Design a protein around this nucleic acid. Sequence first.
RNA 1: ACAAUCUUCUCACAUGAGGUGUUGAACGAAAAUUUAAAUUUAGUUUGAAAUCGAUUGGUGAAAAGUUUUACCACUUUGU
Lengths: 139, 82, 199, 49, 250, 137
Amino acid sequence: KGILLCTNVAARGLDIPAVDWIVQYDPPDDPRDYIHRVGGKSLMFLAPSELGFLRYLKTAKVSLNEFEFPANKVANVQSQLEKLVSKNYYLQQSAKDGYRSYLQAYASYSLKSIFDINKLDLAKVAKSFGFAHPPNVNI
Amino acid sequence: TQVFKLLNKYRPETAAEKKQRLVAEAEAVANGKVSKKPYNVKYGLNHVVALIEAKKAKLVLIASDVDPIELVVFLPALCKKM
Amino acid sequence: FKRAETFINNYRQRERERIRLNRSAKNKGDIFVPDETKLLFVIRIAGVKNMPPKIRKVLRLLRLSRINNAVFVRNNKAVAQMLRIVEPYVMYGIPNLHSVRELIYKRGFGKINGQRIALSDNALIEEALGKYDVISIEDIIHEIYNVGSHFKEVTKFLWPFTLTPVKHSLMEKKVKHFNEGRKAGYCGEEINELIKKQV
Amino acid sequence: YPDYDDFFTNTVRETPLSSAPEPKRRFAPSKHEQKRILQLAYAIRKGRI
Amino acid sequence: ELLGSDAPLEKVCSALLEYESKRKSNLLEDEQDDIEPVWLQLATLKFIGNNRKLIPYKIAIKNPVIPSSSEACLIVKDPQRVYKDLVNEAGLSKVVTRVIGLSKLKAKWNSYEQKRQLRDQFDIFLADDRVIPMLPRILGKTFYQKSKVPVPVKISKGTAEQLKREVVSAYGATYFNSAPCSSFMIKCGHVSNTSTELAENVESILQFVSKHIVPDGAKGIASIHLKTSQSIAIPLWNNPNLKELIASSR
Amino acid sequence: KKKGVLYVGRLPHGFYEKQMRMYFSQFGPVLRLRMSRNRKTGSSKHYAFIEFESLDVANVVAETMHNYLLYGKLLQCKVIPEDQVHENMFKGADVPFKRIPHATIARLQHEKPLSKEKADKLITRHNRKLKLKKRKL
RNA sequence: ACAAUCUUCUCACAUGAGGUGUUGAACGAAAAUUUAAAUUUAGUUUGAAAUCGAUUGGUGAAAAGUUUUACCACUUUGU
């Protein structure tokens, strides 16, 4: 039992043990690698503006089901999360660096038509990182 | 009136009250020896303008009769821009 | 003119009183009834617009019909429960011999034929209270401080005192809502200081 | 005397103007007060204050 | 036995869980082990409460109704740093999630929106006994009407052992909020509970109800039914002398 | 001439029918004032209607106390035109509300002196009350 | 004067009794009950949100049968 956070590249080249859940929190930077790398449960987070990946998986002959969640049961710790980030110096610097790196990774995705940074809403992204307003990162 | 009620709960501490607090902590270390971030209202033209551009200000209150009016003439626009 | 906030502020105060009166009466038919004394001094410090009628009558019974009115009361169960009902409006404590003497000697007013008359001479006291063997100011003081047989008659003869707060300092004259910081409740022996600041 | 033409401020800027990172001055007890506290401490033990 | 010189228990409860399992009848991602709770409906010959009493009844029972993984918020008198240290010392961090001083509860949670956010954040609100009467205010219709009533947990002396004991007793016991009503509903368990466990819960709850709720005793009980959210109020036992009992009391 | 009708919303707890009457009477004479209240409890619904003797005075009040920061609540005073001002929105106006204690009157009829005949009219159909449940078994 | 008294624990012998205090609107299940409307009551939504929908049993306190209470509730409106 346990939970591990790793990048796609760090996990790439490593043997995946018997894991109950595999979660794709961020889009895969190498979808051509991911389609064959997926082969207990496989779950992937996708924004409503990146539904073109659903078409790509259908064209690539990938079976899939719909996972839905009740908005009531989602933890409303957004206020507390905002409080911690702005209060801890090291948590904030980690939060800003992660936000900058996530955006720069997003701008470099191969599937420009699917994962388009222009279609991305920066105010929403910073909210997931614990920001009232998006930090000033040059792309 | 309601604005200034909230503003008067965050007045910066007086020059005497600040020295009163500092000498209180000075005595403690003089004998032998951690606090919270101070909350107050932010003032000063350059400081406030820097806060607005930083998108940190929650409520800006501009005086209506600043003598050279161009000191504050851009603030309504800058406040609306940010 | 009267703004909307003052009307709501009164309603919140009235609801505050109604809850207090219910809680003091319901399930709380008790009083700590201070001991080792029989004479108490009751001063009405504060008043609220549109009092509940129960509070209005109790102040009337205790002869505190106007603010800053002060009345001697015989310390017993009956006055204690009335004082508990009107607690937020009256500040009461135990007067001493010195407080009783100067209050009568400097602010004592009698009920002569139903008008407020200063007790400048003992002839009027003898005329109006000769049947109870009361002839002098000092006799009045002894009766009040000892709560004698004619204590009720003496209190009936005496007007309530008017201990309005004194504003001598320039800071006192300028600050608003100045009432000498008159707190409510049973102040014990501190009322001697409050009288001393007055008489 | 044309009306006010807000060609620039009609849209809200979503990010702070500067990109410089926060210094650690703002997350730790102040050094100016600590400097003055040490100065006042010296004054107390020398009998000046 | 105390009911009417007989105990028609067990068989009824063992059956109702069986009918409950008989009426079994996207994929969802947020799951839980929540099951339909078992309700016990009790009819009396008189109104139990002279007025609504906003302090729940600590009906002690060995089969918990609150799952042991339920998050807890502890509401204590000021100061709260003392009590936060005690919770960490007693090792209740995974159980007592947060400790709130009462003044910080009165100030930092003012809006009804803030009250509803705090309500959904925790599963049970343990509150110190000496600050229970204050909680009617500070927590309005958002708590005391939406099925979130603080529990009177007594930690007066402030020690780790009594924290652990009182906390353990808290989840062990079920809770009932007495109001002026001829009939009242008490939670006994869930469908996952076994027949013997639920029967033990019912008899223990009836014992406490007869002792400390119904002043005249078991004779003041009119009828007993056990039910779930959607099932029928299956009767358990009826008063065999109710004719003369009501005649004397009327 | 035309009696104006004004609607006030977001009433702070305390701005009740009395307080509004001595307040709005300063603006101008009031005719029918009614705060809508709940049936079972009688507690305020936090909105009310005022009928001024004129529609001009109602316009001034609406322009005066609309978005009034009162106890943290922005007051909502909007003038209702005559055509959707309906016939009985002032039913019970200026008449104090009755806080009927349904709980206690239920207690009194639960515990009141009563005779054998009405006791028989109580005990009644006990046996078939289980039988309707028995047929569902 | 947008300020005020909603209790940071009691009493009795580790034990019992007590604490009378909750915004409104909307959705909604099926139950115990009492004398068609009334009491409890699962589970949800919400900026202290609002545009007719008021129900009407009983208790008395002051002015003069009458009008005035805007939580007068059965310990029932002024010791």
